Design a protein around this ligand. Structure first.
Ligand SMILES: NC(=O)c1ccc[n+]([C@@H]2O[C@H](COP(=O)([O-])OP(=O)(O)OC[C@H]3O[C@@H](n4cnc5c(N)ncnc54)[C@H](OP(=O)(O)O)[C@@H]3O)[C@@H](O)[C@H]2O)c1
Ligand SMILES: NC(=O)c1ccc[n+]([C@@H]2O[C@H](COP(=O)([O-])OP(=O)(O)OC[C@H]3O[C@@H](n4cnc5c(N)ncnc54)[C@H](OP(=O)(O)O)[C@@H]3O)[C@@H](O)[C@H]2O)c1
Ligand SMILES: NC(=O)c1ccc[n+]([C@@H]2O[C@H](COP(=O)([O-])OP(=O)(O)OC[C@H]3O[C@@H](n4cnc5c(N)ncnc54)[C@H](OP(=O)(O)O)[C@@H]3O)[C@@H](O)[C@H]2O)c1
Ligand SMILES: NC(=O)c1ccc[n+]([C@@H]2O[C@H](COP(=O)([O-])OP(=O)(O)OC[C@H]3O[C@@H](n4cnc5c(N)ncnc54)[C@H](OP(=O)(O)O)[C@@H]3O)[C@@H](O)[C@H]2O)c1
Ligand SMILES: Nc1nc2[nH]cnc2c(=S)[nH]1
Ligand SMILES: Nc1nc2[nH]cnc2c(=S)[nH]1
Ligand SMILES: Nc1nc2[nH]cnc2c(=S)[nH]1
Ligand SMILES: Nc1nc2[nH]cnc2c(=S)[nH]1
Lengths: 249, 249, 248, 249
């Protein structure tokens, strides 16, 4: 029997690259998505034509609410229903937009930015562990958490909380043989709404090649951490940033 | 006129010591409380005996909810109402209890531990900044954030988010002349519920005198950070832990 | 042709496992040693039996001195003479013993602990870069911010090594040279240590209540030098079973 | 009886401001210097004019060598000889210049940069402890230690080692009642050699005021750490950087 993975926000960009690479390594995959239904089903279709019955999709909003615990439970339940086991969880889904200290209500901004980036990872980790060999969780963090973008306080709060979860969950789930680690991109795939001039500005900041990480490069680090080559690694966060975090103002 | 400070959770323990020390330094103070009305008024009475009309109380639940933004705005407004200005915000209020990965609903535990420790500070910070000299904010963090207590994941996530708020707000509010810093206790006043045996276990681990920090030692670092002696300091977190965070397992 | 790696302190324990795994991946290797000549040679012979003319040894003291820069240049040069290239440097060699604040002279303790852990790595890095998937991997310590009592000079050396990893990552990135670290917590315990003392350390590790094998540390080194790590520089990977997360 | 302090590299700039402020607070001071003999003697004279017999000078090269331990022992001995006690050590002296990886020999550069910034502090700390109230040591570190200047590898190594010393010594000397802490400037007094246009380049990076720290602002943080307001603080490093270390590339 092949092992099974849940990947959150897996329809496009980095989450798709992680899902694809896990599938190429021999995992069966749950492609979680929120709004990108067409891209999700398209991806599932490509993977299933490579190996029959190895990919399913699963829709869920990961905004904080009183029903979020049930949604996260159902995500993990979908992996067990499709494949009979759940070996790996990748917490990739993330809301990302500014929240100036000095449109959506603030309560909605808190719910989305802290829900997607921190509370849903926590609830999915709870559900994953309570349902349970090489078991692991990988959280997508941010290499620039201590050198944050101006006006992104709530996003930064969420990613710092995710670092805390990674460490707290590593410590508490170690007795159960569940490893918990992080992968911290610097600049990888730039925002679609970003103009080429702004993208180039960011690219020229990166010491190693003056270019962003490919989605495959991020996925490589995730694959290492779930592999038997990382069997003693837990509570670690691997920066995949081309040196960006090392560059002063 | 005298500057004014808001201290959250100021009725007892560390928040009380901070309020008293700010008052002794010449601040007028807003003593915020949730459940400890008797104790908040007792402190206010003691401070007003020393200087008439220099201490007022303010009630608010700081749990995350649809009304938390309004409650945070009214805490800040109460300082302006009473004293005509607000120079210092101290984010001290904090829920603290375990939340095992493997009684209150989990959605309530999220609301209290992430609301009090992180979301309320963010909303109080926004309100403080919007309503604006030596302006500063001090957040009460935790020196043991990277070596967390077993089964305290939501608490640890909240304190990590508070570190992120401290840094993000320091950056964004620097152009307004508002400094943002933290004080990180290790073991100070032990939980009232804790047994005397476990209390002594924790005391014995501390390199500097095998004892906990008094509330007044924590308050001393807060006084420094809001003073004219700290006018170039922002985004910094001062550990006050007697070396505890340096001690290996 | 095949790439080439220099591994310092490679005769035994962790450095030996790193050299073996690099060789198994297809690297030719320079096995550096200080005092362990018989172990270094027996490793070289074992590897050459697998593939002819793929392993050589190189003796050098890495203690700080006036001759240290020349010694470090000769180690790098030995890789070029043997194999015509040098793609990977692993800074593994390390002196480790207490230096309380309150029969070696203190100047000798300084020379050995700061030399091996920090100054030699810097000099080897300089020589490596000046001679040019190129990368350097430094062996750090996961417990650098929760140090053993009375190991001030050792801890200083290891912190300096973190600094070198970051500074060199930044400076050599334009030449395509990546610089990273692997940080063990408790791996192979000292040879003389009694099992009852070994057990006090093993019991502290959340993931399996055991120390890392040398092979597990080598696994992280192999990842960092591979094509799967080609955007990774200035990063330090903890391989510690969660030990650094455990409070007093 | 007045306590006594040793300040290394105290003839000029930040070390001088530290010596003056300690003196103003009531300390007798040893003014260590290397080349700046006229400035050291000028400072001792000003301080002695204010309170007789409260300042002496001590010349010493702090480059690494087989005689450095003797030199460090002598600096501490000079304090006991003049004042009969030594309560405070401030490790401020520092070489600072680039050492690119790709007319001083590299041997000399290692000696100077690692000697002054790290080995001399270690040996001074040893002598101080062995010759032994509010005893404490303050190391001058660097807020940019993780975002270093290009081509400053040896300097950066020295400062990283000083962080390690601060933490190791705090742990080991706690049982003797000796506290060990750090103060980490960002941009303070800029290099004398640096041109006006570069200086302006750095000033414009600082979020809080777009200016460098005064020497007196750095000294204020040292004063706090040696005071009775910091009796439970050990192994802590206070950044005094106006937010500089928070700014991304
Ligand atoms: N891209 C970078 O340069 C970079 C840099 C640093 C860190 N990271 C981290 O790496 C990860 C992947 O980055 P990325 O750029 O690929 O991410 P992204 O495109 O910005 O977002 C990934 C997915 O998150 C899902 N999502 C957003 N809001 C949601 C909600 N309320 N409920 C459920 N799902 C929601 C979306 O799914 P749908 O499309 O189906 O709606 C989206 O496709 C993230 O965790 C990110 O923070 C990325
Ligand atoms: N004590 C330590 O050893 C230690 C260690 C590390 C960090 N810290 C940090 O230092 C700060 C003070 O510590 P402490 O021990 O004095 O705190 P505490 O006694 O645990 O809590 C202080 C106050 O927080 C308020 N609070 C709790 N839940 C609230 C809610 N839902 N809404 C509004 N207010 C609420 C309470 O006010 P009412 O009583 O009025 O209800 C309480 O008295 C905290 O931020 C803590 O995390 C303390
Ligand atoms: N073992 C652990 O639990 C652990 C934990 C944290 C970090 N680390 C790090 O991981 C690396 C490997 O650890 P390890 O336990 O395998 O190391 P080790 O056995 O203590 O030493 C490795 C080798 O260092 C060489 N060495 C010592 N002094 C030298 C000198 N003056 N000049 C040149 N070489 C010298 C020795 O070579 P010869 O035998 O040829 O004399 C020795 O075999 C080290 O960097 C260490 O600090 C290990
Ligand atoms: N200035 C900044 O923006 C900044 C930023 C970050 C950190 N810092 C740190 O804060 C501290 C003070 O900074 P600063 O700019 O005032 O320092 P500095 O002027 O560059 O150096 C201070 C003194 O160090 C002494 N020194 C240099 N080489 C020596 C040697 N071989 N032996 C003995 N003493 C030697 C010199 O004494 P003599 O003149 O008597 O020869 C010099 O006056 C330093 O540790 C520095 O690294 C400063
Ligand atoms: N979710 C998300 N997070 C980020 N952090 C830095 N860039 C991003 C993008 S484009 N998306
Ligand atoms: N609010 C709060 N936070 C803490 N962190 C460590 N101990 C505590 C206590 S007793 N209260
Ligand atoms: N060289 C060396 N370094 C270490 N760090 C922790 N343990 C060790 C050992 S046994 N050797
Ligand atoms: N010693 C010394 N150290 C520094 N770090 C940043 N600037 C300096 C200067 S000007 N001198």
């Amino acid at each position: 029997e092949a092992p099974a993975a849940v990947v959150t926000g897996a329809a496009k960009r980095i989450g798709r690259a992680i899902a694809v690479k896990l599938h190429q390594t021999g995992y069966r995959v749950v492609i979680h998505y929120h709004n990108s239904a067409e891209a999700a089903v398209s991806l599932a279709d490509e993977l299933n034509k490579e190996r029959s019955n190895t990919a399913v999709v699963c829709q869920a909003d990961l905004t904080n609410s009183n029903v979020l615990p049930a949604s996260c439970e159902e995500i993990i339940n979908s992996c067990f229903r499709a494949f009979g086991r759940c070996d790996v969880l990748v917490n990739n889904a993330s809301a990302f937009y500014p929240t100036p200290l000095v449109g959506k209500t603030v309560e909605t901004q808190v719910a989305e930015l802290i829900g997607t980036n921190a509370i849903a990872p926590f609830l999915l980790t709870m559900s994953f562990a309570q349902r349970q060999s090489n078991l692991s969780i990988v959280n997508l963090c941010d290499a620039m958490v201590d050198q944050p973008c101006m006006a992104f306080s709530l996003y930064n709060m969420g990613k710092h909380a995710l670092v805390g979860l990674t460490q707290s969950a590593a410590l508490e789930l170690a007795p159960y043989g569940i490893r918990v680690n992080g992968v911290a991109p610097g600049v990888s795939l730039l925002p679609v709404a970003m103009g080429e001039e702004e993208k180039d500005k960011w690219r020229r900041k990166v010491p190693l090649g003056r270019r962003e990480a490919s989605a495959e490069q991020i996925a490589d680090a995730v694959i290492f951490l779930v592999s038997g080559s990382a069997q003693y690694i837990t509570g670690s966060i691997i920066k995949v940033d081309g040196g960006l975090s090392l560059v002063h103002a």
